[PDB]
Design an enzyme around this catalytic site. Structure first.
Site, PDB file in Angstrom:
ATOM      1  N   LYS A 181     -36.718  15.691  59.780  1.00  0.00           N
ATOM      2  CA  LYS A 181     -37.753  14.775  60.260  1.00  0.00           C
ATOM      3  C   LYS A 181     -37.956  13.539  59.369  1.00  0.00           C
ATOM      4  CE  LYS A 181     -39.434  16.333  64.192  1.00  0.00           C
ATOM      5  NZ  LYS A 181     -39.582  15.414  65.356  1.00  0.00           N
TER       6      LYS A 181
ATOM      7  N   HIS B 177     -36.414   7.361  61.874  1.00  0.00           N
ATOM      8  CA  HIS B 177     -37.182   6.678  62.934  1.00  0.00           C
ATOM      9  C   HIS B 177     -37.690   5.303  62.492  1.00  0.00           C
ATOM     10  CE1 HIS B 177     -36.750  10.062  65.442  1.00  0.00           C
ATOM     11  NE2 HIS B 177     -37.941  10.621  65.338  1.00  0.00           N
TER      12      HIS B 177
END
Ligand code: AMP
Length: 365
Positions: free
Chosen positions: A75, A94
């Site tokens: 993540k 991200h």
């Protein structure tokens, strides 16, 4: 020798891992030094990693680890963390698609003299994504779809499919779905047909494998891919199917696969739509019948039809978390050949492509 350091995930309910005990063993057999953080949330028991040859270290210890360890996790970093990132990292960061604070994520690397190799954009020599979770996304999506359809046969419309929980292994999931499915059939329910769009890819294969394993034969699966959708929607086959599983993310402005007009029909058979790649921020959603991204604790949402039987959508963006062990094994094994090139990462195209992409986004800051 390359040293990899598997950091413990901190994101709520994230039980997957970028390296599994198996891929750790395999890397060690190639001369890697592997550190593994003792992770509370991982589906893998820390003893598994120990027995594989990993050096076990405290959760969060990557933050003070020697500069030469490559830090690997799944993540993104907590948006809250502000300290410079000094290591080479492998993760889904991200920050390449103009996400909020993307420049600050990168500044952490810039200030740190660290490097990001982003897992989302890691590419093999033929231009294909190295590792993703599509197969298990499809498999889990099909599992929940069958469960929802079965549930509808044995419960009143005022009840919804209850909260779902991750399973420790695939067999355990299949056993439960089969039980629910067979129960529904025992009521005399017509055997359902399942329409899959994007049937030929990894996601589609995952859905099909689930259907097979629960006793649904090819005769009751309509496998659609590019040729079938090329005529353009809406497709009458969608309301005519009992379950519809969408296994391809499409975001360009085309005619929709179905719509409320077509669904508002007392003769509609369709009970359950599983949009495996659902993303409510999709600019052109080709299944415009929901606005809610459902979640494990409330897995389905009503499609507000004016005619026909109760219809629900599953729009979970975390389907692979239904089977975090197998999801992780598939992901990590897909990533393994690339990892084995890390000793030559200065020249290996997979890593050079990633460094270049990082360098290019850093240049925009
Ligand atoms: N517009 C479309 N309609 C139906 N299938 C598609 C469409 N676009 C891509 N696909 C298929 O979706 C699958 C995606 O595979 P994967 O990325 O491996 O899950 C491939 O078989 C593609 O051919």
């Amino acid at each position: 020798a390359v040293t990899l350091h598997l950091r413990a995930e901190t994101k709520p309910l994230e039980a997957r891992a970028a390296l599994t005990p198996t891929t750790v063993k395999k890397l060690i057999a190639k001369g890697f030094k592997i550190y593994v953080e003792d992770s509370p949330q991982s589906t893998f028991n820390i003893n598994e990693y120990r027995q594989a040859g990993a050096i076990i270290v405290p959760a969060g210890s990557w933050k003070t680890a020697p500069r030469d360890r490559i830090i690997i996790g799944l993540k993104e970093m907590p948006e809250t963390d502000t300290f410079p990132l000094v290591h080479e990292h492998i993760q889904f960061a991200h920050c390449y698609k103009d996400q909020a604070g993307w420049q600050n994520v990168l500044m952490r690397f810039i200030k740190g003299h660290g490097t990001l190799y982003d897992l989302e954009f890691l590419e093999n020599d033929q231009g294909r994504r190295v590792a993703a979770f599509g197969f298990y996304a499809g498999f889990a999506g099909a599992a929940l779809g069958v469960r929802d359809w079965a549930f509808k046969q044995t419960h009143s419309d005022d009840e919804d499919l209850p909260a779902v929980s991750p399973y420790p292994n695939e067999k355990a999931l299949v056993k439960d779905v089969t039980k629910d499915y067979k129960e529904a059939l025992a009521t005399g329910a017509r055997k359902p047909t399942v329409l899959i769009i994007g049937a030929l890819g990894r996601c589609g294969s995952g859905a099909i494998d689930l259907l097979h394993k629960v006793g649904i034969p090819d005769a009751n699966i309509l496998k659609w891919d590019i040729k079938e959708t090329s005529r353009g929607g809406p497709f009458d086959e969608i309301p005519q199917a009992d379950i519809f599983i969408n296994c391809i993310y499409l975001s360009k402005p085309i005619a929709p696969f179905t719509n409320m007009e077509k669904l508002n029909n007392p003769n509609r058979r369709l009970r359950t739509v599983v949009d495996v790649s659902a993303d409510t921020t999709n600019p052109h959603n080709p299944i415009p019948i929901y606005t809610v991204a459902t979640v494990f604790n409330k897995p389905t949402v009503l499609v507000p039809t004016t005619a026909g039987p109760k219809l629900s959508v599953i729009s979970i963006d975390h389907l692979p978390s239904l089977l975090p062990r197998e999801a992780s094994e598939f992901f990590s094994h897909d990533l393994l050949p690339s990892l084995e090139l890390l000793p030559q990462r200065k020249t290996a195209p997979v890593w050079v492509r990633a460094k270049k992409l990082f360098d290019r986004h850093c240049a925009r800051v």
